[PDB]
Amino acid sequence: MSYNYVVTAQKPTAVNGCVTGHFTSAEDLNLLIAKNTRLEIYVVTAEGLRPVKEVGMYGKIAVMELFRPKGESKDLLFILTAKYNACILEYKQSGESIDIITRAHGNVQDRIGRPSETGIIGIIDPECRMIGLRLYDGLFKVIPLDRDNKELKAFNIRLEELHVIDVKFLYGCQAPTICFVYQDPQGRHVKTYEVSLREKEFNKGPWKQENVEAEASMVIAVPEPFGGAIIIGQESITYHNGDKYLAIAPPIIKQSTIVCHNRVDPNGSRYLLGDMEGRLFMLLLEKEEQMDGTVTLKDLRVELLGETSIAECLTYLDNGVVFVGSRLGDSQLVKLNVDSNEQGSYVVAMETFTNLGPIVDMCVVDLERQGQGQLVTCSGAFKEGSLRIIRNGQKLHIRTVPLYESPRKICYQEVSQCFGVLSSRIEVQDTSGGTTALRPSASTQALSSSVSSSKLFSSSTAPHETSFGEEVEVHNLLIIDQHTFEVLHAHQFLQNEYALSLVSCKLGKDPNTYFIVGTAMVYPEEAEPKQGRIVVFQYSDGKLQTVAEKEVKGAVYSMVEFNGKLLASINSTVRLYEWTTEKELRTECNHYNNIMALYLKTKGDFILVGDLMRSVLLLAYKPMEGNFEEIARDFNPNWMSAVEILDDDNFLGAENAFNLFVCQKDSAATTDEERQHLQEVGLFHLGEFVNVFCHGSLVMQNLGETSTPTQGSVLFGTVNGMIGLVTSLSESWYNLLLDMQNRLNKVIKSVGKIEHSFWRSFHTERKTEPATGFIDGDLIESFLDISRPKMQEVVANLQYDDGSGMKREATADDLIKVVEELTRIH
Amino acid sequence: TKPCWYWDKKDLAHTPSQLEGLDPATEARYRREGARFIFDVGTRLGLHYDTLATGIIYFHRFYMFHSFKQFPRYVTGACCLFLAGKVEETPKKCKDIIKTARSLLNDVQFGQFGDDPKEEVMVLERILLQTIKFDLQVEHPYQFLLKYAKQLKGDKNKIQKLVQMAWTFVNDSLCTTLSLQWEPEIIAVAVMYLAGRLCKFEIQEWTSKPMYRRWWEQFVQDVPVDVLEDICHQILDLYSQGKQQMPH
Amino acid sequence: TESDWGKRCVDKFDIIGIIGEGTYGQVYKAKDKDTGELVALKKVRLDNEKEGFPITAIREIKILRQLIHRSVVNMKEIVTDKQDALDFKKDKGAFYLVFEYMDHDLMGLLESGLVHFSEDHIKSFMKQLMEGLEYCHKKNFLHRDIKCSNILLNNSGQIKLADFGLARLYNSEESRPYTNKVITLWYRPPELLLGEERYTPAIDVWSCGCILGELFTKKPIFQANLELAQLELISRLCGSPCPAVWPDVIRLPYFNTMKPKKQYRRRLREEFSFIPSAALDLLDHMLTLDPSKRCTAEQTLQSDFLKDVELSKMAPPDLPHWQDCHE
Numbered sequence A: 001m002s003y004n005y006v007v008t009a010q011k012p013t014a015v016n017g018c019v020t021g022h023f024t025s026a027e028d029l030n031l032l033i034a035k036n037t038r039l040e041i042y043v044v045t046a047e048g049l050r051p052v053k054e055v056g057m058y059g060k061i062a063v064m065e066l067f068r069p070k071g072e073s074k075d076l077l078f079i080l081t082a083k084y085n086a087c088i089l090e091y092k093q094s095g096e097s098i099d100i101i102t103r104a105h106g107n108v109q110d111r112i113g114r115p116s117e118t119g120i121i122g123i124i125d126p127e128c129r130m131i132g133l134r135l136y137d138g139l140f141k142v143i144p145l146d147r148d149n150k151e152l153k154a155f156n157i158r159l160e161e162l163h164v165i166d167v168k169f170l171y172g173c174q175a176p177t178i179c180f181v182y183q184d185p186q187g188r189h190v191k192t193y194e195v196s197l198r199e200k201e202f203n204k205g206p207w208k209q210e211n212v213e214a215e216a217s218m219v220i221a222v223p224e225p226f227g228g229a230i231i232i233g234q235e236s237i238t239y240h241n242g243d244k245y246l247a248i249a250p251p252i253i254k255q256s257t258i259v260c261h262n263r264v265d266p267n268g269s270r271y272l273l274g275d276m277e278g279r280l281f282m283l284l285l286e287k288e289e290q291m292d293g294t295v296t297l298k299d300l301r302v303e304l305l306g307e308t309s310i311a312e313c314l315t316y317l318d319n320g321v322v323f324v325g326s327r328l329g330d331s332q333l334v335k336l337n338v339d340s341n342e343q344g345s346y347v348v349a350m351e352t353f354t355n356l357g358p359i360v361d362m363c364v365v366d367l368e369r370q371g372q373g374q375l376v377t378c379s380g381a382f383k384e385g386s387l388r389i390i391r392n393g394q395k396l397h398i399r400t401v402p403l404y405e406s407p408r409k410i411c412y413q414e415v416s417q418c419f420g421v422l423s424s425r426i427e428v429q430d431t432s433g434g435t436t437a438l439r440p441s442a443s444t445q446a447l448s449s450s451v452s453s454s455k456l457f458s459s460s461t462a463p464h465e466t467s468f469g470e471e472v473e474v475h476n477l478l479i480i481d482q483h484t485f486e487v488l489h490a491h492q493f494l495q496n497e498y499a500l501s502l503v504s505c506k507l508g509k510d511p512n513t514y515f516i517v518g519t520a521m522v523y524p525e526e527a528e529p530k531q532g533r534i535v536v537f538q539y540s541d542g543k544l545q546t547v548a549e550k551e552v553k554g555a556v557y558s559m560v561e562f563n564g565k566l567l568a569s570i571n572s573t574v575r576l577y578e579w580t581t582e583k584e585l586r587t588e589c590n591h592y593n594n595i596m597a598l599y600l601k602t603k604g605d606f607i608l609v610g611d612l613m614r615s616v617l618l619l620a621y622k623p624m625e626g627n628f629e630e631i632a633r634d635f636n637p638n639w640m641s642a643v644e645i646l647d648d649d650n651f652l653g654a655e656n657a658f659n660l661f662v663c664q665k666d667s668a669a670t671t672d673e674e675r676q677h678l679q680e681v682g683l684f685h686l687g688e689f690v691n692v693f694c695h696g697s698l699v700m701q702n703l704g705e706t707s708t709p710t711q712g713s714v715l716f717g718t719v720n721g722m723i724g725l726v727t728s729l730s731e732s733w734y735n736l737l738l739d740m741q742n743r744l745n746k747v748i749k750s751v752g753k754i755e756h757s758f759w760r761s762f763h764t765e766r767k768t769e770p771a772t773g774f775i776d777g778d779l780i781e782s783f784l785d786i787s788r789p790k791m792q793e794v795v796a797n798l799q800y801d802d803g804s805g806m807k808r809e810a811t812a813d814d815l816i817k818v819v820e821e822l823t824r825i826h
Numbered sequence B: 001t002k003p004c005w006y007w008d009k010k011d012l013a014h015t016p017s018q019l020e021g022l023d024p025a026t027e028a029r030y031r032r033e034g035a036r037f038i039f040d041v042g043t044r045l046g047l048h049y050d051t052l053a054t055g056i057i058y059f060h061r062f063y064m065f066h067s068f069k070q071f072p073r074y075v076t077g078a079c080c081l082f083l084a085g086k087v088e089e090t091p092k093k094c095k096d097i098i099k100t101a102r103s104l105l106n107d108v109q110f111g112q113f114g115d116d117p118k119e120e121v122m123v124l125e126r127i128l129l130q131t132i133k134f135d136l137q138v139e140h141p142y143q144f145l146l147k148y149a150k151q152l153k154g155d156k157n158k159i160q161k162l163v164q165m166a167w168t169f170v171n172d173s174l175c176t177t178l179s180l181q182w183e184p185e186i187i188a189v190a191v192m193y194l195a196g197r198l199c200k201f202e203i204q205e206w207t208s209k210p211m212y213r214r215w216w217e218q219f220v221q222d223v224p225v226d227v228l229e230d231i232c233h234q235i236l237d238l239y240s241q242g243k244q245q246m247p248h
Numbered sequence C: 001t002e003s004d005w006g007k008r009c010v011d012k013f014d015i016i017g018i019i020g021e022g023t024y025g026q027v028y029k030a031k032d033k034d035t036g037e038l039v040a041l042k043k044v045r046l047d048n049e050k051e052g053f054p055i056t057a058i059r060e061i062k063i064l065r066q067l068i069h070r071s072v073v074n075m076k077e078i079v080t081d082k083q084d085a086l087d088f089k090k091d092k093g094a095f096y097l098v099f100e101y102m103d104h105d106l107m108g109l110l111e112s113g114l115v116h117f118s119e120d121h122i123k124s125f126m127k128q129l130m131e132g133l134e135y136c137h138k139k140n141f142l143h144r145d146i147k148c149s150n151i152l153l154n155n156s157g158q159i160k161l162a163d164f165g166l167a168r169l170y171n172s173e174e175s176r177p178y179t180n181k182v183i184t185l186w187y188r189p190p191e192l193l194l195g196e197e198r199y200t201p202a203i204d205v206w207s208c209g210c211i212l213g214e215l216f217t218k219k220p221i222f223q224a225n226l227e228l229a230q231l232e233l234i235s236r237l238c239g240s241p242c243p244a245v246w247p248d249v250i251r252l253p254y255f256n257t258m259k260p261k262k263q264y265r266r267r268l269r270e271e272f273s274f275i276p277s278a279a280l281d282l283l284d285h286m287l288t289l290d291p292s293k294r295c296t297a298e299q300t301l302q303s304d305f306l307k308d309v310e311l312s313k314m315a316p317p318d319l320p321h322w323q324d325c326h327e
Ligand SMILES: Cc1cccc(Nc2nc(CC(=O)Nc3ncc(C)s3)cs2)n1
Pocket: A593, A594, A595, A614, A615, A633, A634, A635, A636, C018, C019, C020, C040, C073, C099, C100, C101, C102, C103, C104, C105, C108, C152, C162
C-alpha cells in the first residue's frame, strides 16, 4: 500500500458564482462570492467590500441562491453541491461569535437519470414556495419549501422536452410558472409550464411556444412591472409575454457571445450584459404607460458601457459599483459613470482581485539563487492571459506579467537568463483574406520577431476555405527575460500550426542549450492531427535561430529530455530521438501501445506515460537493447489530465472527474503478470482539475529547517487557480493522521452537514469508492482552529505506534505541535 | 478454414504404425483395445455416451499422425478421455481417470503410465491438441440416429427395436476406423440399414415417401448403397471375428 | 493449410504491448509480420499442470470455430511458443489464441465518459448485439457472461461479442445443474440471484437490457456489491419478485431466504421516462423478472426500436477527438 498527504498552498481564486441579498442581517446588503468549495461573505460599503465571514464546504458549489420565505426576517441561502448535496443555510451572529446554521439538508441524487449537457440548474420561486432543479434530461425536480421539509425531500415531474438550455421561474403569474428554452430537431423554442405542488405535475402554461434563435442561450426573468421573459442569443435579444413580442438585433453583440446578465433596477428597467471579449453592455427596457394605467414594454435598447474582465458572474451592488466575477482572469470592482471619459468609456476600474486563473502550465525556478524556489505559472486565457511569479513571504507574494494572449506552456532556460513560453492569440478572418488581431499582445509587442518559413507541409493541395469573421488561433514561442519579464523575442508558427509541447535542454554531445517545440497541424476537418513538427531553436544574442526541424505524422503532445536524448509522444507513438553530430534528430526506438500519449514523465531510464483513458504506463528504456520495455500498466480505465512520478515505485495521476490516484508496482515477482499489473493503492477526490504536476517547493530553505515527517514535494496547478501539494508519509505517520481524521470528523461541524468521508470518496458518474492512501491535510490543519474543549475531545484514547513508547498516548498540546510542523511544508 | 478428418481405407496401409513394421492386424487390435479402454474407463466414471465417443475419435485421429510404438495407447486413451470430458462439459480430474485406469488394467499394461501416471497423461495434452489441430467439436452417429428415427412413423415397438440395434452397432463401430472413413451422418444411416436387414423391416414404409425404396436419400444426400454395404460388412466382421453375435 | 492450427509459431507476430489481464493468461496487441494485420493474442498457460489446458479456453476454441457472425468475434488461428525440440515432456511453452483486434471495449469508452451515444447510434449498437446473440442462441449456445467489457467495438461502429469463456450449451429437453452466478453481479439476472441452476437463454437478455439502460444513463443501472443488495435495487425498479408476476418464483431455492425490504411496485417506465417510448418498451420486456415472460433476442430484433434500423448505415458513435482531449 502507499501513504500520501495532500494540502492546499493557495485556495481556489476563480469566481464560480456570486449573488446579492440580505443574508447576514435584514438590514445589510450582502455579496456572497462562491469559489470552488469556498463561500465568501461580504458586506457592501460606500468604498468597497467589508469581509465578514468565509466558510469551506465539503463539495463543489453548483447552485447558490438567496431567498426569503414568509415569516423570515432575512434571506436564507440555498446551496447544492456537484455531488448533489443540498442544504439551506442561515447566518447567525452572537456578538463576536459568527457561525453558519444548517436549517435543512439532504442528498437529492436519483438512482436513474442522465446528467444534462447544460449542467445543474437551480432556481427558486418568487413567492419562495419551491426550489426547482434541472439535474437530469427529461426530469424536473421540485423541493417544496414547507416548514416541515427539513430533509429536503423532493419529487420529479416528467418533462417531455429532453434537451433544456435554461429555465427560470417567471414573475407575475397566478401559479408557480417556469419559462425555459429547449432544443429538439426543429430548432430551439421557448415554452412555459405551471407547477402544481398539490397535483405534483405540470399544467398548461400561461403563454404559447415561440420559435427562437438557434443559439438562444439565457433566459432573463423580467420583474412584475413588465412581466414575461427576455431571451439572449448570439445575434438577437427578444422579449416574450403572451401576445407581446419584441426583437432587437444590434450588430454590436454579434461580435462576441454574451455569457452573463444581471438586473440593475429592481423594476426591470435595466439589465447588464457581458460577453466573452470582456465588453459590458446595458440592456434598457423602454416603458410606455397607457391611459388605462397599465405599463407595457415599448422597445429594447443595448448600449455599450466599456470593458471588464471576462466575467463568469456580474452583480450590481449599489450606486455605480458593479462586482465582476472572473474565472479566466482577475475579478474586479468597477464603477459605472453617467458621463463617459475622454475615450468614450463609462467604466472605470476601482479594485482588482487576484485570480490565478486557469493554470495551464507552471515551473519552479530559483531566480534569486535563494535555495527557495519561485513558481512561474501560465495563468488566464485570452485578454486575461498572464505569467504569475509566486513566492512565499504569512501570505503568498504574487507578481503579474500581462500577456493579453493565452499562455500554453512555460519552461526555464538558465543559460539564457530567460523563459520560453508558448502562447496563442485570436485573429479573425478579415476582408483582406488574411486575419486581424482584436488587440495587441505579447507576441506582437516583442522587441524582435520571426516567423517560421518551413517548407515541410508547403506541398498542401488540401483545400481549407475561410469565411469572413471566423476565428483562428495563432501560436508563438515567446522569449521572456527572467528579471524584467520583458518579451525579448516572439516566433510565430505556421498557419494552422498549434504548439503543444516545450522543453529547454542540451542533447547528445552538443554544448548548445536549445528551446525545442512540438507542434501539430490542426485543420477543422481532422478529428486527430496527422501532421506535426519537432523544431529545435537556439536563443542567441537577442535572436531565435531555427537549428533543425523533424517532421512527424501526428501531434507532439508531450516532450521530455531523456539522458541526452529527446523523448517525444506523437499521437499513439512514444519515440526516443538521438541528436547527431550533424545537428539533426534521429529515431532510436518506438513504443506504440497507447491510445493517445498525452503526457510523459521520466525518472532514470523509466518513463511514465499517460494515455487519455487507459491510465498510466510504466515504460523502461533498455540501453543494452536500444528499445523500450513495458514494465506495467494501470488496467482500470481512467482519463488522465496530468501525471507525475513520486518515486521509483509510486506514480500519481489526476482524473478529469476531479479525482487523484496513486499507482504502484505490485512488487510481487512470483508471476510476471503481478509485476505487469499496476495496483491503484491511492484514491482521493480532490475537487479540482489538475493540469500540471511539478516537483518543487515554495518554502524558504536556510538548511536550518527541521526535517518534516513528510518526504517529497509535488506542486500542482488547477483550472480554478488552486495550488496544492502532494507529499509522502511513513506507515506510522499515515495511521496517526488517518486515525486523527476519523476523530476530527466526529468533532468538527460541517456546513450543510456533509459527511467528510463522502466528499473525498473517489467519484465518477459511474463509480464511487471510499478514499484510500491520502490524508486530507486541510482537515488535519484545521485541528489548530478548533476550540480547546474540542481538541481534548479529539485526543481522547489516541495511541501512537513505534515511538519512544510503542503505545504512546497523545495530548492536545502534543498534536498542536505535530500539526504546526505540518503547516510548515507550505 | 476447417480440416479434413476422413481418409480412404487404402490409406490406412500407410499409417506411421504400419510403416514402423506393425502389421494391419496388430494396429487393428491396438485400436480396439484403446477405444474399448476409453469406453470402459469412462463408463465406470459415469460419462455420457458423447464424451466416450469424442475421446475415441480423438484417439483414432491421433494415431493417424503418430505410431503406436512411440505413443502408448492406454496413456493416449486416458489423455483423450481427459480432454473429451472438458470439451463435452463432462469434466473429470486426471487423478480419477488414472485411478480407474489402474483398476481396469493389469500390472503389465499399467506399466505404460511409467513412474508418474498423471504426469505422462497431462504432458500428452499438448501433443493431442496440436495433433487434432484444435478442431474440438465433433458430431457422432447418435444424434443422427435419433434425428432420423424421429421422422419414422409406424409400429412403436419395431422402430424402437430398430433404434436400439442400430445404437449398439454405433457403439461397436467406435472400435473401428469407420470414424475415419465416413461422416457420422452416413454411419447413422448404415446402422439403420443394417438393423433393418437383420430385423427384416422395410424402413421406407415408415417414411413420408413410402414408395421411395432408397429411404435414406431424404436423410443423407449422395450416399450409394456401395457405401452402406461396405460399412455393414466392416461392422459385422467384428462380430464374426469375435465370439459375439448380432444383438437381434 | 490454414486449418492446421497449433503449429505456427508466435514469432510471426510483432508484439506491441499489454492490453488486458485475462482469465487463463494475459492478452497482448500484436501485428502480423506477413500481412500487417493487427491481432489480439490471448495467452494460454498449461505450465500450472493443475488441470492442464484451461477449460475456459477450450470452450472458446470449441465454440468460436463454430460461430460465424459479424457481431461475434473471430478466432483466426492458434499459435505456439518455440517448442522444445524432440522433448515434449520438458516443453512447457504456452499457446496463443489469435483474435481480430477490435479497436475499443465499451467500458473504457463509458468509464472515460468521452463517448456520447445518439438514439440512432444506440439503435445500431443494440441491433448488432441482438443479432449476434440471436445467432448464438439459435445455435443453442449461452454466453453467460454479458458485460460491457466483453462488448468490443471498432471505430467504424461494428460491435462484436467477445468473452465466451463461461459459455455452455443449453438443452430445453434436458435440464441439469449449471454453474451458479455465472454473470457478474451488476448484470446478473434475478434468477441467478435466486439460484435457479437450470437457467434459460433469457439470462443473457437481461444483461443486454441492463446495457440498453446504461447506454441511455451513461451509468450502470444496478450497481451493488452483494447479491441481496442487487435484488433490492432490481426489485425497486422492476418490482419485487412475487408469485403474480413470477408464478414459479416459489420453486426457486432462495425465494423465501432472499427477500426485498418491501414488495416494491414496478417503476421502470416512470424512472426511465426520458428514454424514448420505442426503447422504453424494449427495456420493460428485456428487464422482466420472470424468465418465461422475458422477451427473446428475435423478439428484440422485431421491435419498433430495432426492426427498421438498417445495418448498412452503421453510424459510428461520437468518439473523442483531440479537441475533446483539449479542455
Ligand atoms: C490498460 C490498457 C491499455 C491499452 C489497451 C487496453 N485494453 C484495451 N483493449 C481494447 C480493445 C480490445 O480489447 N480488443 C480485442 N480484440 C480482440 C480481443 C479478444 S480483445 C481497447 S483498450 N488496456
